[PDB]
Chains A and B, each alone.
With several copies, the nearest count.
Chain A
């Protein structure tokens, strides 16, 4: 987990979308494309955050489990 943030993910998605087609050029607030990409990137951000938290929890759990240090 590299701890990405919402803004960079959305920027990357929009940049690739623009690069794959010159027709789509309306990414203003309230646009359908922007809303969809924002939701996707927000879910990715939450996945990354919870993955980091679960890894921290997993390290604590493996420390407990390896030595049987109840």
Chain B
């Protein structure tokens, strides 16, 4: 259950509040009855409220409006930028940082024993959030061979076997495998080739990944309020 709570504003009236919220002034008597208010409902200052603190409310006192409010179906335009940042952060999850020391496991991508946990510098375990989290998960999936992870046959990639010849065919195989691996992630809305080239031994390519938009993540997290889990089991 959730309800709206209104702070009394300067020289406000109960009729104005009723019109503002219920869309009709007629509910002002219901508002009085629910809040248990005596006749001078909104006193000028606290000196009047001292006469009867129980039954009177002054400026800056909080009223309760029993309208069933719900965090979903709320216009994203009202939400504050920091609130949107936190919401997308929750949507994309928090996880322990393992992709630290990028250079090392970039020098040995195909091998095992390549990544490890790290500390945040404050004596606690390091954590990656939001975009850093997505980076970590996409790197780990691409680096993981498919079928090597226990309890998860399909998680991973087949790039360890695509160390083939230097022709456009193997390039296309790599590209298709990478697109499969990126598509496998639920959060990745789509992925597509940008550009590739061959330099004899070395292959080089780059991709573009569109994560779910702020609106979708906001809708998902605010929907999750009904359950209260606020966690990711994808």
Contact = CB atoms under 8 A, between A and B. Distances in A.
B150 A26 contact: no
Interface string B72-93: 0000000000000000001011
Nearest to A41: B151
B230 A25 contact: yes
A38 B15 CA distance: 12
Interface string A1-39: 000001000000010001000111111111111010011
B162 interface: no
Interface in B123-156: 123-125, 127, 133, 137, 140-141, 144, 149-152, 155
B15 A24 contact: no
A6 B234 CA distance: 18
Contacts, number: 82
Contacts of A44: none
Contacts of A18: 231
**How many residues of B sit at the interface, in one of the four size bands?**
20 to 34
A25 B150 contact: no
Contacts of B149: 29-30, 35
B98 interface: yes
B39 A50 contact: yes
Contact of A25 (B15, B117, B123): B123
B90 A25 contact: yes
Contacts of A42: 15, 150-151
A68 interface: no
Contacts of B124: 24, 26, 31-33
Contacts of B38: 53
B165 interface: no
Contacts of B25: 6
14 contacts: A6-B25, A23-B123, A24-B94, A26-B124, A29-B155, A31-B137, A32-B96, A32-B124, A33-B124, A38-B150, A39-B150, A42-B15, A42-B150, A49-B29
